[PDB]
Structures are given as structure tokens and as C-alpha cells.
Design a protein around this ligand. Structure first.
Ligand SMILES: [Zn+2]
Ligand SMILES: [Zn+2]
Ligand SMILES: [Zn+2]
Ligand SMILES: [Zn+2]
Lengths: 145, 4
């Protein structure tokens, strides 16, 4: 069958950003329940099982724009590039920061999601398409194999 | 969410 609302879709994909691959594998998701990033799900819409395709999905339809407000300078004294800090939220739900630069007392931190502001490039194979079982529809997600 |  073909990808649509309430189908469980199994894809084999590669993900590349700025020309470099960041991730790959096989996943199964329930289509039409906001389980995938919007742009990818849109690109999958209507595809027949067995289809292969590329899809460019811009930041606006993936992990959203990079909030320049999420970049801040914190004191070196406040800490206990590429540095990932899982520092405690102020009220709940921690937010991983990543340091981009540090000069003296000053440290530059970033609250944004890693892929924020990034256009994503996907190579995709639609491996299987079937209808969701009633349990999957209840939980609102795929129960793979 | 996904790809994760
Ligand atoms: Zn799912
Ligand atoms: Zn089939
Ligand atoms: Zn049916
Ligand atoms: Zn479940």
C-alpha cells in the first residue's frame, strides 16, 4: 500500500547536514500523528511501498530556526566548544546547552536544538507499509515487530 | 521527534 494517515511506515534513511552524514538506520513510525518532523512526513505522504527518493527538508519544517536569544554569555564561574552541558532547568525539564567559545571569564552557550537552523538532506527507502493495529492507534505510535 |  501507500503512505497515509494511520499507516505504520518502515523507512531506511540516511540523514546529511551541510554535506556530511549525521545519522542513518531503519525506523517505523505511525503516519499522521506528528511522530516525524513535518517536512519528512510530508515528503513521505502518498509514497508507495518500495519507493526511493531524496528529500530536502529546510529548518522551518524540521527542528525550527536558530533562536539568537538562545545564545548567551555565561561566566566561567557558573560552570561546575562542542561542550554539552545537561544543566538543570530553572523550573523543570532540563535543557542541554552547548558551548561554542570561551574567552577568559566569558563563555558562550547555546540552548537551541543541535539541528536548529540546519537544512536536512534525506535519502529514503519506503521498506514496508501496513495499517496500524488498534493498539497502535490508541498509543498514537508504532509498535515495531 | 524522529529521526532519533
Ligand atoms: Zn511512531
Ligand atoms: Zn507490503
Ligand atoms: Zn482496516
Ligand atoms: Zn504503545
Amino acid at each position: 500500500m501507500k503512505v497515509g494517515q494511520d499507516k505504520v511506515v518502515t523507512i531506511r534513511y540516511t540523514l546529511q547536514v551541510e554535506g556530511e552524514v549525521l545519522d542513518q538506520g531503519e525506523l517505523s513510525y505511525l503516519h499522521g500523528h506528528r511522530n516525524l518532523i513535518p517536512g519528512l512526513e510530508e515528503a513521505l505522504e502518498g509514497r508507495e511501498e518500495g519507493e526511493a527518493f531524496q528529500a530536502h527538508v529546510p529548518a522551518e519544517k524540521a527542528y525550527g530556526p536558530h533562536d539568537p536569544e538562545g545564545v548567551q554569555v555565561v561566566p566561567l564561574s557558573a560552570f561546575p566548544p562542542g561542550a554539552q552541558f545537561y544543566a538543570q532547568d530553572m523550573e523543570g525539564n532540563p535543557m542541554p546547552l552547548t558551548v561554542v567559545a570561551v574567552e577568559g571569564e566569558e563563555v558562550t552557550v547555546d540552548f537551541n536544538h543541535p539541528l536548529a537552523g540546519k537544512d536536512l538532506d534525506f535519502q529514503v527507502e519506503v521498506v514496508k507499509v501496513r495499517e496500524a493495529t488498534p493498539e497502535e492507534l490508541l498509543h498514537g505510535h508504532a509498535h515495531p515487530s | 521527534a524522529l529521526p532519533a
